[PDB]
Design a protein around this nucleic acid. Structure first.
Lengths: 87, 87
DNA sequence: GCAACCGAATTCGGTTGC
DNA sequence: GCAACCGAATTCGGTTGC
C-alpha cells in the first residue's frame, strides 16, 4: 500500500491559513507536510471552499494527531491518501 | 479501487498558472478538475516548486490527455491518485 | 485558542508581444 | 503556444485583541 495518509481541511481561506500557522508552531511534531491554501480553480468546480492538505508518516501517527488537535468549528475535514511519490 | 487518476505539475508559479488557463482553454474536455497553484509550506518541504493538480474521469482518459497535450518544457510532471472522496 | 487585521508578497484571469 | 506582463485580488507570516 503506497498510500500516504492525509487530511484535507476546508473553510474560509483566512481561518485555514492561521490554522496552518498554529499547527506549525504548536504541533509541528505531529505530522509530516502541509499545503498552502488551495481551491478548485476550474469553472467547474465541486465547491467554493479553500483547502489545505496535511500529510503523515503513518496512519498510526495520523491518529495521534486527531486525538490531540483542536479543530476550529469553522472548518470541516476528511481523511484520504495520495500517492506517496507525489510528495 | 476508489482512487482518482491525477497528474501533478511543478515549476515556476506563473508559468504553471498560465498553463492551467490554456488547459482550460483548449483542452477543457480532456480532464475533470484542476487546482489553484500550490506549494508545500514548511520545510519539512521537499522542494520549492509551485504545484498544480489535475484530475480525470478515468485512467483511459488520463491517457488521452497525455497524448494530446503539449507540456511546457519548463514544467515537470508525475502521475498518481487521491482518493477520491476528497474531491 | 481563535480569527480579524497588518503591509508586504504573491497569484488571479486575462492579453499581448515574441 | 509560451510566459512576461497587467492591474485588481487574493494568500503570506505574523501579531494583536478578544
Amino acid at each position: 500500500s503506497s498510500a500516504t495518509p492525509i487530511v484535507q481541511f476546508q473553510g474560509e481561506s483566512n481561518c485555514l491559513k492561521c490554522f496552518r500557522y498554529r499547527l506549525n508552531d504548536k504541533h509541528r511534531h505531529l505530522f509530516d507536510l502541509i499545503s498552502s491554501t488551495w481551491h478548485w480553480a476550474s469553472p467547474k468546480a465541486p465547491h467554493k471552499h479553500a483547502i489545505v492538505t496535511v500529510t503523515y508518516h503513518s496512519e498510526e501517527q495520523r491518529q495521534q494527531f486527531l486525538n490531540v488537535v483542536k479543530i476550529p468549528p469553522t472548518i470541516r475535514h476528511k481523511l484520504g491518501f495520495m500517492s506517496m511519490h507525489l510528495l
